[PDB]
């Protein structure tokens, strides 16, 4: 009557569409998670920046006055 | 070439299309499993670790805020 | 003061309950996705089984 | 009051998931019977 493979391809493609939709939803959720984490951690680069600035500042001061003593 | 074999070749194309579709489905399902079961939990673990970071150093944060009005 | 402490214990246990139920829902959702994938790939077997019912079925006849 | 309300949605999605899981297992049982019949014939 009808080509046997037609229904097979129909079902296979339908399932492919379904799981690709699942993939899209999963990656969208992942993107939301990453955005949340970045916004939350936006304090950490501030922390790191001021810490690095303090380190450079104390090193420069130990250069300006010669209190920098030999290593151990 | 042959007529019986040319109908055979049409059927070959049908078989190859089916098996390629099956392989594609398997690959996409593996990708979905990798995303859902591995990548997202590790992202969540990294989130928890970074939260513990910012929690442990909050005493420095509050000092710097008290004098810098940041 | 005691009522406040009661309330804060409530909030603590409720938030941990919320996160645990989150975990439960996510696990069940993943399991359901996998199961429905199994069903989707399996549904085609009914037709071939029905075709092979013509050779041997046993109790039915 | 509002706190039992805070809970009730969670049990609601739990109920929805459990109902879906039940239906999925019934469908899987149908598939299992089909597989058994095919196995017996072959």
């Amino acid at each position: 009557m009808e080509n046997p493979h037609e229904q097979v391809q129909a079902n296979i493609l339908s399932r492919i569409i379904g799981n690709v939709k699942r993939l899209n939803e999963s990656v969208a959720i992942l993107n939301q998670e990453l955005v949340t984490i970045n916004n939350r951690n936006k304090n950490l680069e501030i922390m790191g920046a001021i810490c690095d600035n303090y380190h450079s500042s104390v090193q420069f001061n130990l250069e300006a006055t010669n209190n920098k003593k030999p290593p151990l | 070439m042959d007529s019986a074999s040319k109908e055979e070749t049409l059927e070959k194309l049908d078989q190859e299309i089916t098996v390629n579709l099956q392989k594609i489905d398997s690959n996409l399902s593996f990708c979905f499993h990798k995303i859902t079961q591995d990548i997202i939990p590790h992202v969540a673990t990294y989130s928890e670790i970074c939260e513990r970071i910012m929690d442990s150093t909050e005493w420095l944060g509050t000092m710097f805020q008290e004098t810098g009005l940041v | 003061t005691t009522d406040k402490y009661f309330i804060e214990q409530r909030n603590i246990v409720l938030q941990e309950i919320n996160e645990t139920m989150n975990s439960i829902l996510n696990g069940l959702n993943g399991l359901n996705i996998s199961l429905e994938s199994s069903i989707a790939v399996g549904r085609e077997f009914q037709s071939v089984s029905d075709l092979w019912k013509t050779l041997y079925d046993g109790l039915e006849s | 009051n509002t706190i039992q309300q805070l809970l009730l949605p969670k049990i609601r999605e739990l109920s929805d998931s459990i109902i879906t899981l039940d239906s999925n297992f019934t469908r899987l049982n149908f598939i299992h019977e089909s597989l058994a019949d095919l196995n017996e014939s072959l």
Binding site: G18, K21, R22, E25, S26, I29, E33 | T36, I40 | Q15, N18, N22, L25, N26, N29, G30, N32, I33, E36 | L6, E13, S17, T20
Partner: peptide, 11 residues
């Protein structure tokens, strides 16, 4: 009637 990946988070 097909479940969709919906990771719940927070409250």
């Amino acid at each position: 009637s097909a479940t969709e990946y919906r990771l719940s988070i927070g409250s």
